[PDB]
Each structure stands twice: as structure tokens, then as C-alpha cells.
Design a protein around this nucleic acid. Structure first.
Ligand SMILES: [Mg+2]
Ligand SMILES: [Mg+2]
Ligand SMILES: [Mg+2]
Ligand SMILES: [Mg+2]
Ligand SMILES: [Mg+2]
Ligand SMILES: [Mg+2]
Ligand SMILES: [Mg+2]
Ligand SMILES: [Mg+2]
Ligand SMILES: [Mg+2]
Ligand SMILES: [Mg+2]
Ligand SMILES: [Mg+2]
Ligand SMILES: [Mg+2]
Ligand SMILES: [Mg+2]
Ligand SMILES: [Mg+2]
Ligand SMILES: [Mg+2]
Ligand SMILES: [Mg+2]
Ligand SMILES: [Mg+2]
Ligand SMILES: [Mg+2]
Ligand SMILES: [Mg+2]
Ligand SMILES: [Mg+2]
Ligand SMILES: [Mg+2]
Ligand SMILES: [Mg+2]
Ligand SMILES: [Mg+2]
Ligand SMILES: [Mg+2]
Ligand SMILES: [Mg+2]
Ligand SMILES: [Mg+2]
Ligand SMILES: [Mg+2]
Ligand SMILES: [Mg+2]
Ligand SMILES: [Mg+2]
Ligand SMILES: [Mg+2]
Ligand SMILES: [Mg+2]
Ligand SMILES: [Mg+2]
Ligand SMILES: [Mg+2]
Ligand SMILES: [Mg+2]
Ligand SMILES: [Mg+2]
Ligand SMILES: [Mg+2]
Ligand SMILES: [Mg+2]
Ligand SMILES: [Mg+2]
Ligand SMILES: [Mg+2]
Ligand SMILES: [Mg+2]
Ligand SMILES: [Mg+2]
Lengths: 124, 210, 53, 124, 53, 147
RNA sequence: AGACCCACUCCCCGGCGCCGGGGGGCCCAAGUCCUUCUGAUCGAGGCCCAGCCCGUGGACGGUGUGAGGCCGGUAGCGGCCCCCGGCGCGCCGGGCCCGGGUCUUCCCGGAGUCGGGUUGCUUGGGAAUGCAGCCCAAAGCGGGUGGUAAACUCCAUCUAA
RNA sequence: AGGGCGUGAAACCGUUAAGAGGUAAACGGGUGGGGUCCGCGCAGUCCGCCCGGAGGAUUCAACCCGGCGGCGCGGUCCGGCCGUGCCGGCGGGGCGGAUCUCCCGCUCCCGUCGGCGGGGGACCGCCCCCCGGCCGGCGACCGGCCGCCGCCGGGCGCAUU
RNA sequence: GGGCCCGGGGGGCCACGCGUCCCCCGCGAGCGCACGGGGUCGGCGGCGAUGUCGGCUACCCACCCGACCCGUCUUGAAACACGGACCAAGGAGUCUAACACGUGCGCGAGUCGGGGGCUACGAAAGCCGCCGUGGCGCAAUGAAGGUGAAGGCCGGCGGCGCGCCGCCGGCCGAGGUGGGAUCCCGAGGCCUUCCAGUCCGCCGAGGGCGCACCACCGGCCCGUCUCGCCCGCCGCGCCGG
RNA sequence: UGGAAUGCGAGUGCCUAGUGGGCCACUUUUGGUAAGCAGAACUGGCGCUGCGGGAUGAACCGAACGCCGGGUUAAGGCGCC
RNA sequence: GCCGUCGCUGGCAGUCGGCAGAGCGAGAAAGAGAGUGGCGCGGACGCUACGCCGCGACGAGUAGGAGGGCCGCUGCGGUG
């Protein structure tokens, strides 16, 4: 279970960074890079991940499908959204709220998508 | 100095014990050395049983262990004599002989005699010259099936005679086990003095009679 | 902690061969990091060689 | 001991709860139908409890069954049931002190001469 | 769990001290939710004392 | 491990935790159990009564095998046999009683602590206690002496 | 030893010839490919599907860093060449003339040693565990041991010098 | 790195530069002055919404096609695996049992009969696998269909969006 | 003076519907200001690219106040007590065994294979089960011989005289008192138009089962002392109970 | 009508270091001519403890100590230092 | 005002959202109960629960004890 798996990795993980009085987690599907039970991208049945597209255009939204929990190859569904800034967030907002897919990650996903999009603008 | 409650200890470290500490770091090497010598011995003596000669059954001494039988040193000369095996021939066919051991009772004697006869039945005997079979040699058909036996030969086991439930008779019910035990101790304790008193009384009465 | 699903056996070409094996019960055993780290701690000293001046 | 305390009047159909291990007692002949909750139950005590029709819960199952602890019988093992409590109290060498001393061996030659009989010095 | 080890003389899997570890599911179940008192999630910070006089 | 011990926490503290006045000296009071009848008397008499003196007879060449006599109470008697032995005899109508051979289980004397189930049984043993014999007889059993 | 039944031809010594573990020697995979950093590099990047090549060899060492592929090596029930040993099989000259059981009749044992006293040492060995000196000094159904000295009496267990 | 040569500390010393100097020096707190440098300062933030002016479009919603996904008490759809569930099996078996019991080897006694050891079988407990019915999960364990919803790609929408 | 400052004949009231019987004689809407659950301005000014702005602490210097040199033994050290000229590196509670208690983990009336055996890292790890011999625990007590851990009721009989002992057969049965976390029952009660009475919960006087633990009182096992009457038998005893 | 006031949560068990040279003051007090002497009782101190005052000072007087701003005090002071 | 300690063995799993409805600080036990009859698609942060939050008191220390060190040194197993 998620709680059992958190108790094994909360302080022992190859993704754990403890430095400068700060703690970070570098695993995928962690929307804040935060060593937290809520934001851990590995232990929950459902997780939300936002990443920049392989080309610097748009974001890739990752959702964990329900069935294949023990099958890493088919576990994650990737969707590339390369619309305008407001449209991208609206898609992400709906993919979470309407589906009730981790509604508590809604703003974390939306804040991460804005940060990735803002990064892809020309550097001044 | 003692401090509050505790045990009074007398460690035996008042000599130069550090001069004579036997460490055991060669233990795995010893185990490999002994195993390598068992395998090399089994190959040398094959197809004879690797464990060695057959050992007799014996009862462990003292009242702490006389309920258990184990492997002895060698078969008594009486047991070999009853089984018709010559004591000098016996070792040459893997039978252990113990000239020191006695046979106080018939049952243990016959248990080992049966052991020998059974072993003599499973013994595959090769001709001294393979091309020249002799009187006692086992047949060619059973020689091609000869294999080296691992583990003690005919292992010795303690088997208990399971007694099935039965109706309790009135005789057994009225038996007084504790009272019987206590009286047996007293009679064994007073046997000599009681006879001493009987002898003296008889002499005392006789001197008055005559 | 009672479910034992069927695990697919994959051929040498990386495809499921159609055979299945019920998940062995050992994979549902309690996961105890403290026990493992205790046993790993003490067993790993058993292959050490002594050193001394 | 669980059967003895769960046999008292008015305790029928209650759940015996012990935060500890339920060991087996071979000195018992007949095990009734119990409903117990424990942290551990010894292998042989499980077969005996289940064979009699009883039920063995885990403390996570007790919360779902009895969120507030209703219909329970909380039970404890003997706390002074330890060899150490034999050695506590007045020191063994004081009047009317039935404390157990610390002796390496037990026998006639081990702390029985002086102070334990009037024939050798004194007794108390 | 039902069948002891066959290749180990006398062994069986260690028993679970907690059958269901899905703590979130346990806490959100109606059984536990029915026994709870209402949460007290209002912060009562320190009041600055003003002199009535 | 030495990283969890006081010595690591006594670094920079003069006296290493033994005091400035009394210090840590070699052997104040004597070595080992010295002083028993002397400056260490109160400890010995307070915590080790009987320690000094002699009591009882000597026995040269004691052989502890001769006194070997493991004992078992009646409350554990039925554990020496299989479970199906007691239930089968409990539910049989002929009245046949099972034989419990304590010596086979490694015991010589049977003792009387406990109570027996209301069930006839035949007990074999080298030795019996009086209360053990009465309790075995109370349930219709019989005591059998072996050597 | 004898009598009577029963069973026996391979067992070894010295020579001579032919057939299946040890020491030594010599060898056995694959990149110095294309860019580029450097004083020099063993570094970085690349080597189509696919994934430079070998891999039973990605131990280690050397070589102008930091190297599975440059060299030595490493792996391998890999190869070749010498020498030693072990194990079988024949020929010659020799030795032995070999055993089991049942009866009959015979024979049978270690001495200044044991043991005892005393002294000294030693031991857990305590009216003396072992050893040694001096004195006494054996027996032959005897002798020794049987963890408390001794007399009587049964037993057990061995057979010292 | 110039042959006791890798690096090259501190104490101690030479010189240069700056500062200062009659209560030995040094030290805590508080300022002030001066330098060494740092901000890689010197018209001083960034973000969201909205108003307005100017422009420019891989142009908005809604509908159509296709893919993927979440959920469904689909009030009770089919199919699956499956119950550390409960019931009926002539079910085909493994393990264990201090629960009972036709075959043989050795052995005592007259060719017999009794004893040890060696095996079937029956029974009980548990487990595995086959079959039928109820309840059940698929949130450590899912497919097909139907529905709703979301997302994506392509059309169509061509402009008060 | 006190009696909601009793009763009768200019100034402040946290008086302000009414149907009634009668002692006595359950929701109005808004809006605004604030001595109201800890500060804001929906207020401004000056200067700024080669000499100026900011930089706690840090480098040097000055001043004011403070300020005796550390470690140590000691009642007391700045001491006319001892070590210390200065710098670098080294330099002192460790390891083995035993024991005690505490804590953590495994299993649990058991537990432990440590010795032995089987099957590069690896001298590891894995296994043994008729390898658990053995240790510790499961039984204490006595110098020892040794002994070695609840009873009550019913019916019948023998003895002594309703009461006591012994012997038979049937029933029940591991103690009690005080306190005691927890649990259980529940007199009554938890509201919304008003009554009746339901289903789920929820509080509660009182009353129960009572964990662990403690105090106290009984019981049982072994040694010993006093008293005393009996019961058993292959050994009739200086016997055994 | 938990049967005076007042205040306060209590009980209990293991393991345990250092210490076992003390010294000072009011009062009481033994020896001594007395002693900054030797020896006691009580409490409080120094030792282990800084800080304001007593110029200076182990113990006196006040008061006990996290790092700060404002206010007010104690014992002591207010010619100048 | 700020730091830490101790205490409340204090509060927070209720982020229960368009399968929605925002409360449980309030002098004085127990239900924001259930029923039966008489246009827009939106709503900050949080929660390493070994975490986060609130409130109150407190803070001298030799010998000595204890806790915590994202203090520091060397080597081993994992990981980056
Ligand atoms: Mg001490
Ligand atoms: Mg200190
Ligand atoms: Mg010192
Ligand atoms: Mg100390
Ligand atoms: Mg001292
Ligand atoms: Mg001293
Ligand atoms: Mg010491
Ligand atoms: Mg090569
Ligand atoms: Mg190299
Ligand atoms: Mg390269
Ligand atoms: Mg290399
Ligand atoms: Mg390469
Ligand atoms: Mg090579
Ligand atoms: Mg090779
Ligand atoms: Mg001889
Ligand atoms: Mg001699
Ligand atoms: Mg000598
Ligand atoms: Mg000696
Ligand atoms: Mg004797
Ligand atoms: Mg150089
Ligand atoms: Mg050098
Ligand atoms: Mg140099
Ligand atoms: Mg100058
Ligand atoms: Mg001054
Ligand atoms: Mg000065
Ligand atoms: Mg000193
Ligand atoms: Mg002095
Ligand atoms: Mg000093
Ligand atoms: Mg001076
Ligand atoms: Mg000195
Ligand atoms: Mg000096
Ligand atoms: Mg140093
Ligand atoms: Mg412990
Ligand atoms: Mg090695
Ligand atoms: Mg004085
Ligand atoms: Mg001192
Ligand atoms: Mg103090
Ligand atoms: Mg002070
Ligand atoms: Mg003065
Ligand atoms: Mg102030
Ligand atoms: Mg402090």
C-alpha cells in the first residue's frame, strides 16, 4: 500500500536529497520535487506528472492508469499539450477536476505547467 | 569493589591467558580439509561403504542413558562366533570386531547376531581375481549393480514398542505404586541389619535352650 | 494482503509466452526494513578477516 | 488466562483485546470459542483458537469493527511475571527479606553458611 | 500461509501484524467516520490585552 | 559500536567523568573479592548472606548421571502423546485407556501439580509421587512401575 | 599336538618388458576506427535497423591522465612439448608348501617389582592423585582398582612391573 | 619542478605597502575615521486581471471522425481470475499421526506354532488439484460491450470569437 | 437607612404587541461609524556614472566604559602554589570474558546449531531434524537419606457417642476481601410549527463484570518442632503412609 | 452538608555517577587570656555563582543570570573624580 | 520582541467540491439526525504525520548524569 511504501522510502531512497537544511525528491511524477507523502510520484495508485515536451514546445501530462500497477511499461499515460498558455492550463484543470484524479494536485500541476511554459519563452 | 547488589564473580584470568588463546579462524579451512579427505578416502575404498565398517548396537551405560542404544566399537567375539564369522576374516569384509566387549545378556547378543546375518545378506563380494570367480564370491549379475553406500551402515535407531489402549483391570487399579516404592526402599535399606538381628536372636535363644 | 494474482512468463524475445504462475505467497510477506538492516548489518561482518598490530 | 478472564459473567460475545502476544497454554484441555485481538498470536495458539470457531483480529481490524472500543475486554499479561522481580525488594541479607540473591551456581556450597542459619554466626 | 515449507524442515511465512495497511482507506471508512467528533480546525491565536480602564 | 558510547561525549571534559577529587585510581579497595570479611563486609552480608562458612557433607567423585531423574507434572501429562490419542479415548465406549509412557518422553518421575481431565489413562514411570498416584487414580487410571 | 570330518592353489620377494596426478617450458578474443580536449593522453562525443567489436575473457598491472579491445595477462573439461610419479598387464629366477569345525590330551606368563612405612614434591584428589629418595619387602583360586582410615564377608572389573 | 629538486603549512626572519605609537602588550561592549575589495550598483522591481490605442495570426466556441483515459449503486450486462469463505461430491493426490490392522526376513519349539524387524490397508488432521450451488473481491488482483465525462489528433468553423 | 428605595392621596428607565387564565391589587430588512479578536497611509521629499551610494562582520587606527593568566589540587589562586619560551605532527576509558538491569528484534513453554556434517566476492551464504547431544527455561526443598506443589457437597456403610474418624460410589469445583484503567446495563434526557410513536446514534445518577498491580486474609509443596488417632501389606517390620 | 484555613496532581519501581578534606555569618554554645584558634546546635550562605552596592575583598547588603528595547526599583547613593 | 526547554501525554487524516455546499470556541451533558401518521464548470497554502500548527509557564551551574547534533575525521556496504 501507499502508506506502507512511504514508511520504507520516507528517509531511504535513491531520489532523496538532504542538503542545506532542505529535502527534495527527484523522482518522476513529483509535481513539487518535494519529499512528501502527497507529492511522491511512485507510491500512489494515481499520480499526476507535468514535464516539458521533448522539444521545447508544450507540456506532457502523465497520469497513472488504474489497472497495471505492477507493470511499469504500461502504467503511465502521456499526453502532449502544445496550446496557448491559458488553454494548456484549462486542459490540465479539467483532466484533474472533471475526472476526480488527485483533485488535491490541481494547483500544483497548474503551477508546474505555468513554470514550464514560462521557461519556454525566449530568454531576455 | 562491589557496587550495590550483584553476583560475586571469580573469573579465571589470573594467569597469562593471552599467551594461550586458541582462535578459530582456521575453522572453515579445517572443515574443507576434512571434507576433502573424506571424498578422497571414499574414492580410494570404493565401492566399499564410505562411512566405514559396520558397527554393533550397544546400550549406553548409567541410568541417564540406558534407555538409548547407539553404535558400539566392534562386534563381540561371541556374536561373531554365533553368526559363524571368523574374527580374523571379519575385518576383511568390513565388520568391526571388539575383543574387549562382553555379552551379559542373551537379548543384546542375539540383536547383534541378527544384525550380522542381515549385513552378511546385503554384502556384495567381489572375486579376488575378476576372471576367476570363487565359492563365496557374489554373482556377476549383482556385481555390476554394486555402489558405494553413504552414511552409517544399517543405521541404528531407537524404536519404541507402541502399546495400544486396553481396559484397565481391577488388579492394576488397586496397585499402590507409591506405597510399593517406599517399602522397597526401606527393605533394601534394612536388609543387612534385620538379618544381623535375626542371627543374634537365634543364638541368644539357643544358648538358653541348651 | 491475501490477493495472489497471476504473473506472466515472458519469452526470451520479451513477449508473454502465454504461461502464467500464481504469485508465490512470499511476495506478500511483511516488509520489515528494520529486520533486514539488522540481519544485513550482522551477517556482513562474518566474511571479515582479522587485523592486528 | 484469556479464557479465565473471558469466562467471567457478563463477558459473553465480547472481543478480548491484548496489546501483546497471545501465547499457548498446553495445560488447557478445552478451548472455547473466543474472539481476540492481539499484536501477535503464537502459531499453536492460532490453530487452537480457530479450530474452536474463534476469530483472530488485528488492531487495524478492531478499529473497523470497534472504532470506540465498544464490546471489548482489555486484557494484560502478568507484569511481575519475570525472573527479575524475584531479585527486587529488601536486600536478601536483611530480616524477613525473601529476595532472591545473585549466585553463579545453586547448591550447598553457594551462599548458605553464614547469615542463613543460626548455626553459622546468625540468621535473619 | 496455508502450507508450511516443504524444503525447509520446519518453517512458515511470518505472520502479519497489520492485515490492511491502507491507512487512508481505513480512516475514510464510514465505520470510523461515524465515531469521530467534529474536527476543531479554528486557530485561536493570542489576544493582545487592552487596558479596560 | 564505539560511536554510540560515552567516550565520544567525554571529549574536552577533563577527568573523563571520574571526578576531580577522587580521580580514577588503579584499585582502591582491593582486587576482585578482597575485603569480604573487612572493609567490604556490609556489601557481602547485605547482598550475599551465607557466603562465608561451610555447610553439609562432602561427596567425592560425584557423578550427576546417578541422580538423573527428570520430572513431569500431571498438568502436562497428556502432551506426551498425540492429540488424537486423548480424543479417541475420550469418545470410545469400550472404556479402553491409553498408555502414557513417560520414560519414552524422557521423564522418570511423575509429580502431582495440576489436575487431570476426567479420563482413564495408564501411566508408566520409574517413580511416582503420592499425590500424583491419587490424582491418576481419581480419574480411573492405573500407575505402572518400570525399571 | 594328535584323531576325525571338511576345504584348498594364489600369496609374496628380486629382475625384465608393454597400456592408461605432479614440476617445467611455449602459445591462443576483441578499436589505437571518426571528430575533439591535452605537454601527452587510457578523457569527451560518434560508430544504420541494432546494439562499434570480443566476452567461458568487464581480475589486475604496465604504457606520457583515468584503457575489457595498445602490451602482459584474465577465461577455457584450451592446445603443443619435455620430465617425474601413480595404476594395470605379461616373462624370467626365487620363497610358502599354507586353512576351518568337533573332540582327546596338554601349556599358560614380566621381582629389589608390587605392596607397606616415612620423607619431600605434586594434584581437584580430601586418614594422602601422581612422582621420587631411604627402610621393609610379596603372592599365585594371586595381584590391582572398586574416590573416608580399618577388620570380616560377598560381588564387579582388569591382568602391572 | 634546477640534482636532499612533488606540494610546500606554522612558528621565526627580510623587505615592501598602509596605519599607529609616553601608563608592556593583548582583550569584551559601543561607536566613529580610514583602507581592501564586493554589489560584476548609479534614475531602480516583477506578476495577474481589467480599460483603451494600434497591429499580427500553426484562430475561438459549437458540431463530425478517430485514439486514449477516469467513473459507473450498468438501480441487478457479459466473460474472466479468484476467496488466508461456506456447503454436496463414489471425486484424483501429497504431508503428518504415541489411532487401528493381509504379506515377508530372522528367530524359539514340533513338518507346526509362537516372538522381533520389515510392508500394504483402514481411520483422523491438514494441504494441493478436479467437479456442482450460495455469498464475494478484482483499491497489493481485469477484459469485452453500453453510458457519462475529460484529454489529445484531424476536419468544419475564417472572425463583434 | 432597607423593603425590585412599601403603600395610599424637572429628570432618568438594558419600560414599551396582545389575546387571555391568573398571584397580588424562537428567523424583519438594510445601510453606515467605530476607544471593538496586535499597522497602515487609497501620504510625501532629496540624490545618483568617475565620484558618489550601500556592505553587519572582517583589516588598521582612535576614543569611552569594562577588563589580573591559563590548566590544576584546593575551604580559598592573579598569587610570593606547581606545569606552560614558541610552532608542527603524535598523545590517554580500549579489546576479550563474566555478571546485572534497561532497550530493540525473532520465536514462544519453549528456544538456541554456536560443535559437526551436506551442498573472484565465497573463510560468505544455504541446508540438516533419528544431527537438539547439550545449555538455559519448564520445580522446589533438605546437610543428607529423600520427599516434591487446592477442595467441597450428596448417598451408603464400620467405629466412637445430632456430633467426629475411616471406607465406598455420584455432583460441582483452582480461593476470598478492599482498591482498580477499561468494558457492560441504563432512571432520565439530547428542541425548531404542534401531538403520537418508531429507526440510528449520543450524555448520564445508579448498578454489574472486573485487567495489570498493590495491601490483607486463606490454601498447597519441602525442612524442622509439638500433639495425636488411624490406615496398608508378597516381607507384619526398629516396615510404609 | 467528602465535615478547619491555605496551597498543590500524585503514587510507584528499576538502574545509577560524583561525593564521603569543607569553610563562612546571625543567634545558642564547649575549651582557651585570646586568636583570621580548636569543637558543636539551627538556619542561611560560599564551595558550584555571575550581577548592583560595601573604593578594593569567596561569605557582608540587595538580588540570583536565555539574547534585546522601553519603564520602575532594591541595597546604596547624588561637591569633582 | 526573538531563541530554546517544559507543559497542555493540546489541535490537523475534513484537501469530506458541480456524485459540491464550506459550521462544531462555545458559560452551563447528549443530533447542523432519519423518515411514518394526525448564463458560467470555478474555488490560495497545506500533510518530509519522525510533519505542520496553537496556547501558557519557564531558562544560574562545578563534580556528575542524559538528550540532540544537516558538528568534524578515517575505512566498508548501498546510492547520487
Ligand atoms: Mg561505584
Ligand atoms: Mg561538566
Ligand atoms: Mg584528574
Ligand atoms: Mg561517571
Ligand atoms: Mg574516590
Ligand atoms: Mg579525598
Ligand atoms: Mg577502575
Ligand atoms: Mg591480447
Ligand atoms: Mg592505467
Ligand atoms: Mg571514446
Ligand atoms: Mg587497463
Ligand atoms: Mg569502449
Ligand atoms: Mg591474452
Ligand atoms: Mg589458462
Ligand atoms: Mg603383557
Ligand atoms: Mg609403581
Ligand atoms: Mg617444587
Ligand atoms: Mg599445589
Ligand atoms: Mg569405602
Ligand atoms: Mg612543481
Ligand atoms: Mg619534499
Ligand atoms: Mg619544492
Ligand atoms: Mg611604516
Ligand atoms: Mg577602568
Ligand atoms: Mg589594566
Ligand atoms: Mg595541581
Ligand atoms: Mg592549602
Ligand atoms: Mg587558577
Ligand atoms: Mg600572595
Ligand atoms: Mg605540586
Ligand atoms: Mg617552568
Ligand atoms: Mg594532533
Ligand atoms: Mg533483555
Ligand atoms: Mg576470500
Ligand atoms: Mg570554627
Ligand atoms: Mg571541591
Ligand atoms: Mg546550590
Ligand atoms: Mg550568589
Ligand atoms: Mg570599605
Ligand atoms: Mg532596562
Ligand atoms: Mg541551564
Amino acid at each position: 500500500s501507499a502508506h506502507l511504501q512511504w514508511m520504507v522510502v520516507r528517509n531511504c531512497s535513491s531520489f532523496l536529497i538532504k542538503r542545506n537544511k532542505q529535502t527534495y525528491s527527484t523522482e518522476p511524477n513529483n509535481l513539487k520535487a518535494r519529499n512528501s507523502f502527497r507529492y511522491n510520484g511512485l507510491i500512489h495508485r494515481k499520480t499526476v506528472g507535468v514535464e516539458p515536451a521533448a522539444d521545447g514546445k508544450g507540456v506532457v501530462v502523465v497520469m497513472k492508469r488504474r489497472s497495471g500497477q505492477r507493470k511499469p511499461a504500461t502504467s503511465y499515460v502521456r499526453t502532449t499539450i502544445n496550446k496557448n498558455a491559458r488553454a494548456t492550463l484549462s486542459s490540465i484543470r479539467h483532466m484533474i477536476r472533471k475526472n476526480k484524479y488527485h483533485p488535491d494536485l490541481r494547483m500544483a500541476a497548474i503551477r508546474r505547467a505555468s513554470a514550464i511554459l514560462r521557461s519556454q519563452k525566449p530568454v531576455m | 569493589a562491589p557496587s550495590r547488589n550483584g553476583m560475586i564473580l571469580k573469573p579465571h584470568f589470573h594467569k597469562d591467558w593471552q599467551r594461550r588463546v586458541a582462535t578459530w579462524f582456521n575453522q572453515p579451512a579445517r572443515k574443507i580439509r576434512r571434507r576433502k579427505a573424506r571424498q578422497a578416502r571414499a574414492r580410494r575404498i570404493a565401492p566399499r561403504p564410505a562411512a566405514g565398517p559396520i558397527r554393533p548396537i550397544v546400550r549406553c551405560p548409567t541410568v541417564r542413558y540406558h534407555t538409548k542404544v547407539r553404535a558400539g566399537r566392534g562386534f563381540s567375539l561371541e556374536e561373531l562366533r554365533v553368526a559363524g564369522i571368523h574374527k580374523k576374516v571379519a575385518r576383511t569384509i568390513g565388520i568391526s570386531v571388539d575383543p574387549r566387549r562382553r555379552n551379559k545378556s542373551t537379548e543384546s547378543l542375539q540383536a547383534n547376531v541378527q544384525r550380522l546375518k542381515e549385513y552378511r545378506s546385503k554384502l556384495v563380494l567381489f572375486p579376488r581375481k575378476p576372471s576367476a570367480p570363487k565359492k563365496g564370491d557374489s554373482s556377476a549379475e549383482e556385481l555390476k549393480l554394486a555402489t558405494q553406500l553413504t552414511g552409517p551402515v544399517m543405521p541404528i535407531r531407537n524404536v519404541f514398542k507402541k502399546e495400544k489402549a486396553r481396559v484397565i483391570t481391577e488388579e492394576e487399579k488397586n496397585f499402590k505404586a507409591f506405597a510399593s516404592l517406599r517399602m522397597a526402599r526401606a527393605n533394601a535399606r534394612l536388609f543387612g541389619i534385620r538379618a544381623k538381628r535375626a542371627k543374634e536372636a537365634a543364638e541368644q535363644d539357643v544358648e538358653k535352650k541348651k | 494482503a491475501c490477493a495472489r494474482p497471476l504473473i506472466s512468463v515472458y519469452s526470451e524475445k520479451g513477449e508473454s509466452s502465454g504461461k502464467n504462475v500464481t504469485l508465490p505467497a512470499v511476495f506478500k510477506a511483511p516488509i520489515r526494513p528494520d529486520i533486514v538492516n539488522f540481519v544485513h548489518t550482522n551477517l556482513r561482518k562474518n566474511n571479515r578477516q582479522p587485523y592486528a598490530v | 488466562r484469556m479464557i479465565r478472564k473471558m469466562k467471567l459473567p457478563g463477558r459473553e460475545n465480547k472481543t478480548a483485546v491484548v496489546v501483546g502476544t497471545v501465547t499457548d497454554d498446553v495445560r488447557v484441555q478445552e478451548v472455547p470459542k473466543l474472539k481476540v485481538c492481539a499484536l501477535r498470536v503464537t502459531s499453536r495458539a492460532r490453530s487452537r483458537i480457530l479450530k474452536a470457531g474463534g476469530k483472530i483480529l488485528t488492531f487495524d481490524q478492531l478499529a473497523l469493527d470497534s472504532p470506540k472500543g465498544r464490546g471489548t475486554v482489555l486484557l494484560s499479561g502478568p507484569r511481575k511475571g519475570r525472573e527479575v522481580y524475584r531479585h527486587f525488594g529488601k536486600a536478601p541479607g536483611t530480616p524477613h527479606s525473601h529476595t532472591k540473591p545473585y549466585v553463579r551456581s545453586k547448591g550447598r556450597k553457594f551462599e548458605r553458611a553464614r547469615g542463613r542459619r543460626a548455626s553459622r554466626g546468625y540468621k535473619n | 500461509w496455508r502450507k508450511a515449507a516443504s524444503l525447509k524442515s520446519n518453517y512458515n511465512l511470518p505472520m502479519h501484524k497489520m492485515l490492511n495497511t491502507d491507512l487512508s482507506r481505513i480512516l475514510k471508512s464510514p465505520e470510523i467516520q461515524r465515531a469521530l467528533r467534529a474536527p476543531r480546525k479554528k486557530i485561536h491565536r493570542r489576544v493582545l490585552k487592552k487596558n479596560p480602564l | 559500536p564505539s560511536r554510540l558510547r560515552k567516550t565520544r561525549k567525554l571529549r574536552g571534559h577533563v577527568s573523563h567523568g571520574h571526578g576531580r577529587i577522587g580521580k580514577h585510581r588503579k584499585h582502591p579497595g582491593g582486587r576482585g573479592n578482597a575485603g569480604g570479611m573487612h572493609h567490604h563486609r556490609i556489601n557481602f552480608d547485605k547482598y550475599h548472606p551465607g557466603y562465608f562458612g561451610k555447610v553439609g557433607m562432602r561427596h567425592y567423585h560425584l557423578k550427576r548421571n546417578q541422580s538423573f531423574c527428570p520430572t513431569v507434572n500431571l498438568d502436562k501429562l497428556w502432551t506426551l502423546v498425540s492429540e488424537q490419542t486423548r480424543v479417541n479415548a475420550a469418545k470410545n465406549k469400550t472404556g479402553a485407556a491409553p498408555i502414557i509412557d513417560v520414560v519414552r518422553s524422557g521423564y522418570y518421575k511423575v509429580l502431582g501439580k495440576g489436575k487431570l481431565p476426567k479420563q482413564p489413562v495408564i501411566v508408566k514411570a520409574k517413580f511416582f509421587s503420592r499425590r500424583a498416584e491419587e490424582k491418576i487414580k481419581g480419574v480411573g487410571g492405573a500407575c505402572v512401575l518400570v525399571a
